[PDB]
Amino acid sequence: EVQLQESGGGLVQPGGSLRLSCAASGFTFSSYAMGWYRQAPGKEREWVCAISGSGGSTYYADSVKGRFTCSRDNSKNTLYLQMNSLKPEDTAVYYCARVVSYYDQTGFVYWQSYDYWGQGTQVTV
Amino acid sequence: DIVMTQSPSFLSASVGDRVTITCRASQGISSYLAWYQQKPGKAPKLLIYAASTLQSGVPSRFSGSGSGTEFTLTISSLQPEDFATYYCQQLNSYPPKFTFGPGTKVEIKRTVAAPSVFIFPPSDEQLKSGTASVVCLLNNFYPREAKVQWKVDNALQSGNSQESVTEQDSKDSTYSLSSTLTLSKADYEKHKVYACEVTHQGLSSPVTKSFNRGE
Amino acid sequence: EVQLVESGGGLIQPGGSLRLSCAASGLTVSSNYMSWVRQAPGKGLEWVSVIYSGGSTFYADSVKGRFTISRDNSKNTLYLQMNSLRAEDTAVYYCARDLDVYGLDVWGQGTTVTVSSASTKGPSVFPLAPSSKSGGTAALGCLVKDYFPEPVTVSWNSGALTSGVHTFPAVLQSSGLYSLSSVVTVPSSSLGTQTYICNVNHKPSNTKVDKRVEPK
Amino acid sequence: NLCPFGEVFNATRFASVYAWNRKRISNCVADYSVLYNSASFSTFKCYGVSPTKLNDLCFTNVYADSFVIRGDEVRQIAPGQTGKIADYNYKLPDDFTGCVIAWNSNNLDSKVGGNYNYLYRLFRKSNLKPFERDISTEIYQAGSTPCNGVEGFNCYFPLQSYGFQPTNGVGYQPYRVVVLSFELLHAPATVCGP
Ligand SMILES: *[C@@H]1O[C@H](CO)[C@@H](O)[C@H](O)[C@H]1NC(C)=O
């Protein structure tokens, strides 16, 4: 886990479509599931999506389900979050990192992030 | 988080005295405590680890005790080279690897000495630059605790003064203070009387030194 | 024998980068926990980062994502790369060997890192003249104002006058420049006979000033 | 033939983390309800399998690894973690399929003068491979000079004891940890749910 750069866009109109991209190096991208973490201005960080190495299992939060789609191309070691039906509440900064999932005692699934960081800045979406 | 506190902040003692300084923790840390000594301009020196075990090459007068939330460092006989700042450090903490204490400074005790107070008006050369600095000098006082009040036309001033205190002197073990009141030239010409009032143990009443602009 | 020798400190603009190095003798950096601890001017000691024997690296929250700890084993040297400095990192940094519950035994001499957007400026020397008000003691001095960076050196009568001289620690102002005062207490009978000059040297600006303080 | 989970979970004396105990569950019927219907576990995290489906699955073998660590170190018992426990005492594989369960043990493993029978490996040159057990008591060499089996400067004993006192904070307080690992091989399946 040597680095993780991010891209995708900035200011964008409501009800629009845009995709956010993340790059990876120093590890087998297909081996580790990657996740998108969104941090709102003045609010806490929130897990929006997580995708397995295969992509056969994709997990999304209820706050954004039905609108964003998370995809990965293991060929280029890149992470994609396609954002559609945009609303002003989705205005935040997005970050990528390696992620792992666990089941609690009652069967619900939560996600844990490998300790690292990706540096980027967004001001409107 | 576990917070480390150290008391006293300042302690005055003489050579041969027995010195005890305490370090407290918000939550019990068992014996995960270390004691270090630092002198001005030099790196910290490890004195005690595990809160009771002496580091090799450290004199036996240093001793540590305590478990849980309260720990103590004791010097059986204070020696002239033992005058320094002492820190306590938590070991195997989370999230930080270790957390140091605020620090305790051990200083040379002596008789109470009243300060000598002098006031210095701004120089005309500085007045040409557009800024005026008035200086108050407190010379050769003990104990260190002293208060300086800057007054302009009998009005107490806050937010325009900066202070500096020298270390204990090599000969008479006396501290000295220098306070600067910085203002604009226009404000300096707008007022006439500038005074510095010093409060100290050696003074029965606070001592005020004043000057009037333009003599 | 045992010694950690540091280098790489200096003056940096905010947002800049600096690499600190710590060469080791008497211990192997690989086989030891190696930590960086910084002391801010006039404050206590704060842990920065730690590197393990197995390669695990841990950083403090204040410097997460900006500082990187590394080691070279051919040179037995510990390295700290500091990027995006933010002027609260201005401190004296030390490299130490960590023994966990046994504490940090071996420290280094420390290197000073100062982060400031201020420009190197020559000091202005002004006279703190003695007051007209005696037969006893009078106080005179010099104010060395608006200089960057530290340090400066102040002497009296080219070193002939060292008794009663107090050169106070400098203070950092809102402008980012330092101010200092040097005072001396002299017999007042010598005010009209002996001529007192303060000699101030600021090497970074190549400034040398001799200011005569005379009663006004 | 009920699987002996209680032998690991409800045992009086646990093991040190540097010498973590492993028990092989085989040829028995396992009811995981006793584990996932209990309220005595501070940490219950299953990676790669949900507890609810566990009673409906068959495995070739099961492994129960028990040890005692500090609370602040319980986070290290997880895939892709770094730390003294993870690097030198007990390493979980990144592709870990199993359940980590942990409960407080201040009532049993904390003594007024301190329990010094629980130890962790403090010094080790290289990080531990997954499911490795280092029980060496060799003196660690921190410098060029050989130790010759004598403790001294740059020559330290590899194991250090936890100070487990009842007045310690929760992070410094002891926690008992059991890790269940389920293995399926090209062999007859012996561990099955009800
Ligand atoms: C341990 O004993 C308690 C008390 O009877 C019981 O509730 C629990 O199920 C036991 N644990 C196991 C793993 O059997």
Side-chain angles (χ1 to χ4, degrees), chain A residues 2 7-12 14-16 18 20-36 38-80 82-125, chain B, chain C residues 1-131 135-216, chain D residues 3-55 57-194:
Chain A
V2 70
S7 38
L11 156 81
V12 138
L18 184 68
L20 259 49
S21 277
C22 166
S25 37
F27 66 103
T28 325
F29 190 89
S30 77
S31 280
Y32 294 83
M34 308 274 297
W36 273 116
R38 159 175 84 188
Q39 192 220 309
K43 287 182 182 189
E44 277 170 54
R45 316 182 171 289
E46 178 176 57
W47 162 84
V48 16
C49 116
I51 186 163
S52 100
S54 54
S57 306
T58 54
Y59 305 68
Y60 302 82
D62 287 339
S63 61
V64 86
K65 265 170 80 173
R67 316 186 314 251
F68 298 170
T69 280
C70 260
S71 70
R72 55 155 69 212
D73 194 3
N74 300 301
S75 324
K76 341 199 199 102
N77 290 183
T78 52
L79 181 71
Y80 304 135
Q82 241 284 354
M83 328 168 304
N84 308 303
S85 312
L86 270 198
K87 70 181 181 191
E89 288 75 59
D90 300 349
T91 305
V93 191
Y94 293 59
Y95 304 115
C96 68
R98 316 147 83 204
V99 85
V100 75
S101 65
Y102 66 85
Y103 295 82
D104 83 1
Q105 199 165 347
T106 44
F108 315 125
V109 200
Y110 300 111
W111 294 87
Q112 290 194 298
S113 58
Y114 284 67
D115 272 0
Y116 202 61
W117 28 79
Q119 295 92 247
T121 306
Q122 282 94 3
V123 286
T124 318
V125 28
Chain B
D1 317 63
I2 296 200
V3 171
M4 300 301 242
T5 40
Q6 234 180 298
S7 77
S9 325
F10 293 94
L11 174 127
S12 268
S14 285
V15 182
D17 296 348
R18 181 177 182 252
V19 183
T20 317
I21 46 177
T22 89
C23 178
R24 275 179 227 74
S26 42
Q27 302 164 243
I29 64 164
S30 187
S31 296
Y32 292 109
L33 193 288
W35 281 103
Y36 301 75
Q37 170 205 66
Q38 198 194 6
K39 291 186 191 175
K42 298 208 291 188
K45 199 180 104 204
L46 173 67
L47 295 189
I48 297 127
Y49 60 83
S52 46
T53 316
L54 251 170
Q55 170 84 181
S56 208
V58 183
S60 54
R61 45 164 178 295
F62 300 105
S63 100
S65 71
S67 194
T69 37
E70 208 242 2
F71 307 90
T72 28
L73 164 57
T74 300
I75 318 181
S76 56
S77 191
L78 199 65
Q79 246 59 69
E81 55 276 70
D82 289 1
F83 289 106
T85 314
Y86 293 89
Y87 291 95
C88 61
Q89 169 198 52
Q90 197 204 137
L91 305 170
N92 314 350
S93 48
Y94 184 73
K97 179 152 237 273
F98 27 82
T99 276
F100 285 98
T104 286
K105 192 176 205 165
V106 182
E107 314 212 73
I108 306 161
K109 183 157 54 42
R110 73 144 282 166
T111 69
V112 159
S116 297
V117 187
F118 311 84
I119 199 170
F120 299 115
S123 71
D124 289 358
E125 330 169 4
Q126 201 198 6
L127 289 185
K128 311 174 129 272
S129 79
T131 304
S133 277
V134 188
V135 185
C136 197
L137 161 71
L138 287 66
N139 204 61
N140 296 133
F141 60 89
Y142 185 94
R144 186 163 182 280
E145 179 62 41
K147 174 203 229 147
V148 165
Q149 178 58 66
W150 273 113
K151 309 215 274 193
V152 177
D153 279 356
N154 260 247
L156 280 73
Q157 301 280 301
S158 181
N160 41 8
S161 52
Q162 245 165 354
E163 259 176 17
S164 206
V165 176
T166 54
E167 295 298 302
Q168 226 165 358
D169 199 61
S170 39
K171 309 179 195 203
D172 54 340
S173 300
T174 55
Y175 310 92
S176 288
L177 189 143
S178 163
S179 199
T180 317
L181 179 90
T182 315
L183 56 160
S184 86
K185 186 194 155 147
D187 309 6
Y188 179 64
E189 316 282 48
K190 278 198 245 272
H191 302 107
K192 178 128 298 194
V193 178
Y194 300 81
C196 176
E197 166 176 54
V198 170
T199 306
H200 190 246
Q201 274 196 36
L203 312 170
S204 98
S205 180
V207 174
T208 307
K209 297 285 169 167
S210 74
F211 83 88
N212 300 35
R213 179 185 38 82
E215 276 263 11
Chain C
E1 193 23 69
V2 312
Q3 46 178 185
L4 300 177
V5 186
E6 301 154 69
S7 41
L11 224 67
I12 191 95
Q13 191 205 336
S17 312
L18 278 170
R19 183 159 103 148
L20 308 188
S21 309
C22 172
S25 195
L27 63 105
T28 290
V29 167
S30 305
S31 311
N32 278 298
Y33 297 109
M34 305 282 329
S35 300
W36 286 96
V37 186
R38 63 182 182 185
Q39 192 157 9
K43 323 271 164 233
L45 301 144
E46 157 176 49
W47 171 70
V48 176
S49 176
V50 65
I51 181 149
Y52 281 28
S53 46
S56 299
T57 65
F58 306 93
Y59 306 85
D61 293 1
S62 50
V63 292
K64 279 227 205 76
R66 301 187 292 124
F67 288 18
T68 303
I69 184 149
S70 43
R71 64 196 186 187
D72 196 314
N73 305 107
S74 67
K75 326 192 191 210
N76 212 9
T77 313
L78 182 69
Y79 301 106
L80 185 69
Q81 182 90 35
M82 292 156 66
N83 298 351
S84 300
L85 296 185
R86 50 186 40 181
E88 26 266 29
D89 301 345
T90 292
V92 176
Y93 291 71
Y94 310 79
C95 61
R97 195 257 300 249
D98 187 28
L99 293 176
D100 212 42
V101 78
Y102 310 137
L104 301 143
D105 50 342
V106 188
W107 293 68
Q109 86 274 7
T111 184
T112 309
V113 167
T114 302
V115 192
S116 185
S117 51
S119 307
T120 295
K121 190 192 165 293
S124 285
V125 190
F126 301 119
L128 282 42
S131 311
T137 310
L140 70 139
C142 279
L143 182 79
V144 173
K145 197 175 198 295
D146 301 317
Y147 71 83
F148 193 78
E150 281 255 77
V152 301
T153 44
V154 191
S155 84
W156 285 92
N157 289 357
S158 292
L161 179 62
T162 88
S163 210
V165 171
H166 289 300
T167 304
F168 291 83
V171 294
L172 185 66
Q173 309 165 110
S174 68
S175 44
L177 307 178
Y178 293 96
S179 209
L180 185 135
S181 50
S182 207
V183 311
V184 53
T185 43
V186 301
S188 49
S189 61
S190 71
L191 274 197
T193 306
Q194 173 73 172
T195 291
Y196 298 104
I197 304 79
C198 69
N199 329 122
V200 180
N201 188 15
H202 187 238
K203 303 231 181 203
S205 61
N206 304 301
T207 291
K208 233 157 212 162
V209 176
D210 292 284
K211 184 100 228 190
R212 185 194 156 159
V213 178
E214 35 202 327
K216 184 181 182 181
Chain D
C3 293
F5 286 140
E7 205 173 323
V8 201
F9 281 78
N10 278 356
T12 296
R13 249 289 163 161
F14 261 50
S16 302
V17 63
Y18 89 98
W20 46 279
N21 257 325
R22 170 164 281 197
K23 190 218 198 342
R24 202 172 93 122
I25 325 293
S26 313
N27 254 289
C28 56
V29 187
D31 190 7
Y32 301 97
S33 281
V34 187
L35 300 187
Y36 65 54
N37 278 353
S38 192
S40 64
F41 303 131
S42 322
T43 288
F44 201 115
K45 286 144 141 265
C46 293
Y47 308 84
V49 59
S50 149
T52 80
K53 332 172 179 125
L54 265 179
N55 265 359
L57 285 180
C58 280
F59 297 101
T60 295
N61 289 128
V62 175
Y63 295 101
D65 301 350
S66 78
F67 51 88
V68 161
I69 54 171
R70 272 176 46 188
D72 291 319
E73 290 161 353
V74 181
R75 50 176 271 110
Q76 302 195 12
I77 314 301
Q81 270 277 352
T82 54
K84 289 190 289 174
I85 310 303
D87 294 353
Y88 313 131
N89 287 284
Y90 190 79
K91 186 63 191 154
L92 270 189
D94 304 62
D95 51 303
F96 172 65
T97 296
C99 297
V100 176
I101 316 152
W103 58 96
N104 191 292
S105 39
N106 206 57
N107 70 308
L108 285 178
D109 294 314
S110 271
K111 322 310 216 174
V112 278
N115 187 3
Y116 293 109
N117 300 323
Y118 284 118
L119 304 120
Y120 63 97
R121 178 155 322 254
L122 179 51
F123 303 110
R124 200 172 187 288
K125 225 302 199 183
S126 35
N127 287 344
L128 222 62
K129 295 190 64 163
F131 294 128
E132 193 170 5
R133 204 158 148 287
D134 196 359
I135 48 160
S136 194
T137 36
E138 209 160 62
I139 279 82
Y140 187 72
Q141 192 187 306
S144 267
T145 283
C147 299
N148 301 306
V150 190
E151 295 162 55
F153 179 75
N154 275 1
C155 280
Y156 312 111
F157 198 72
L159 301 170
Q160 183 67 251
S161 174
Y162 293 110
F164 279 147
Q165 294 172 205
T167 36
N168 287 4
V170 277
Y172 287 72
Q173 273 181 5
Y175 275 74
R176 295 192 167 185
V177 176
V178 172
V179 176
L180 296 187
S181 326
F182 318 100
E183 92 162 359
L184 191 77
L185 298 172
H186 294 294
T190 80
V191 173
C192 282

